Amino acid sequence: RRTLWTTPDTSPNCKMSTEKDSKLTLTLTKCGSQVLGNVSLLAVTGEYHQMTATTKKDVKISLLFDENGILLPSSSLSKDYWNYRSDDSIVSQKYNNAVPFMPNLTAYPKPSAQNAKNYSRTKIISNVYLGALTYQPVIITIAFNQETENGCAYSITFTFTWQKDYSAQQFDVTSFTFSYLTQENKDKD
Amino acid sequence: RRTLWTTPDTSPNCKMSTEKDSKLTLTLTKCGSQVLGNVSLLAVTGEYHQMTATTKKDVKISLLFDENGILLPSSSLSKDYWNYRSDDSIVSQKYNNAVPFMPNLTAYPKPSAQNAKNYSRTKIISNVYLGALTYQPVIITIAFNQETENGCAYSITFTFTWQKDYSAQQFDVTSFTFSYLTQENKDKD
Amino acid sequence: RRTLWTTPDTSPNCKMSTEKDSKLTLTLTKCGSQVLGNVSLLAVTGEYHQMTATTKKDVKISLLFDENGILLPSSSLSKDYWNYRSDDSIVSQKYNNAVPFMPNLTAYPKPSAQNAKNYSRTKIISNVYLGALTYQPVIITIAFNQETENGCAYSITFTFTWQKDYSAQQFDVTSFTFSYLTQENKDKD
Ligand SMILES: CC(=O)N[C@H]1[C@H]([C@H](O)[C@H](O)CO)O[C@@](O)(C(=O)O)C[C@@H]1O
Ligand SMILES: CC(=O)N[C@H]1[C@H]([C@H](O)[C@H](O)CO)O[C@@](O)(C(=O)O)C[C@@H]1O
Ligand SMILES: CC(=O)N[C@H]1[C@H]([C@H](O)[C@H](O)CO)O[C@@](O)(C(=O)O)C[C@@H]1O
């Protein structure tokens, strides 16, 4: 139907530093030509659960998709935790076409040998806040179709960068709203 | 139908400092799994209409809802000014179920004795601008389901905090767009 | 149907400094009472393609609309590049009513002789980032119905202001998501 999500439930589903150390909460709702997205990230275990002065202040969460809009297994997000919504959970059928949720390849073209620097419109940059504390910005960069690894047709990545020393804190950020233009393709299984 | 709002019209509808001293403009539009929200606030009378150096730089607007998604009378927003949209105004029938507009309780759980600190995803933090002047930030914090007062089932609060001295100015801020995941429940009267 | 856009394709369509020196990418998707908007801007030729220390750090892109929601020819955006979406392009019929996409005149009234200063809710102010570089903010101000020139019924303007010296760089900014309340009127040709 019209929502792809992680659910807001079940277990750790995502890699920040190590396997399944974090919960990505992501909802993509189809609104015609655009998706309305909503994202947040929490470290449950590992380095980012209790940062140190040496913790790298840059974390990239990569969602890579095939030609059918289906999440690839090399993604940061586990596939077992991502699908069309059903009653606060996900549908039982595993491999559902999702091209209408994919970022538009004309608006957001893959990076090329021809175009040295890609269009800045392929990114959204803003701040979210660590611990929901207003003095603790974390820069969020959302990029569309800028990955080429593992034969991906589409990509959505969420990069969190920061400057301030958040040592001894758990990585946990406020929610961020965004939108992007979708691929026109539609078909199903 | 698919919009709950204050309307952009009628009188002062909200308490910042004193009763009906302000106009909250709020529109919630249902887009499947998410609501697309749009908010702004204006002080019409009282302290916040002409701030002083001693004016507290923190204003919380609380919308508290019952089990049916209906605004509770202890809210900052008057109930007479809040309902489903009809032709630039509101519907005549007063008590309309609105669970499909309520923030999801799994994504945004009420704060618990078990979980000392709640998930940061329960909040959105950004800036709006006082007087629409780019050198006058006001931090907006939107929180979902973080109130427990007056037996509320759900809550949406808008907190405006700031640092700079806005003495002699009227509190009036730019509009802010946001979204949140909705409760799955749907039923009606 | 439910999207008005520039397309993400074809040629320069917009004036920053001189005629057709830039590509405005703008998509407006109708979501009931609100439009979900998405905007970015790129300078292709002229001053803003290679800025200097004397380049004015203020660029206003004006979309002016008639009573039917149709773009006026005095707008910054060329009319040949703006219409309802069709399969990654635009519809062939040129003059299509678009009142349901226009900003609400009660929420966002035209400026008046009576009201010395207009409601700040008529604007959205945030930052986008030049070159998608996180140290290069550009303030975006979106204003609804604040133009009166050329007999316009409605307006949407995008102003980009900045402080930092971006000499030798191409003006190109990250994408920005926003929403606004729509006029209730609906009719067609
Ligand atoms: C919401 C917001 O903009 N917060 C910002 C705060 C505020 O402006 C406050 O006045 C004081 O923290 O200032 C910062 O320098 C900070 O604290 O790190 C950047 C941060 O992004
Ligand atoms: C839209 C925006 O980000 N405005 C910010 C401005 C600008 O960056 C300008 O360069 C100069 O006001 O700087 C501030 O310090 C300020 O004025 O209070 C914080 C404010 O949030
Ligand atoms: C996304 C964001 O907020 N970027 C801001 C950065 C960061 O806060 C970084 O820590 C260091 O650039 O700081 C600024 O002073 C800058 O660089 O111009 C303002 C800019 O808006």
Author numbering:
A (entry chain A), B (entry chain A), C (entry chain A): 186 to 374
Provide text from the study.
Adenoviruses are clinically important, both as human pathogens and as platforms for therapeutic applications. Species D adenovirus type 26 (HAdV-D26) is both a cause of EKC and other diseases and a promising vaccine vector. Here, we demonstrate that HAdV-D26 uses sialic acid–bearing glycans as a primary entry receptor and that this interaction can form a productive infection. We solve the structure of HAdV-D26K in complex with sialic acid [N-acetylneuraminic acid (Neu5Ac)], revealing a similar topology to the known sialic acid–interacting HAdV-D37 fiber knob in the sialic acid–binding pocket, but highlight crucial mechanistic differences likely to enhance HAdV-D26 affinity for sialic acid compared to other types.
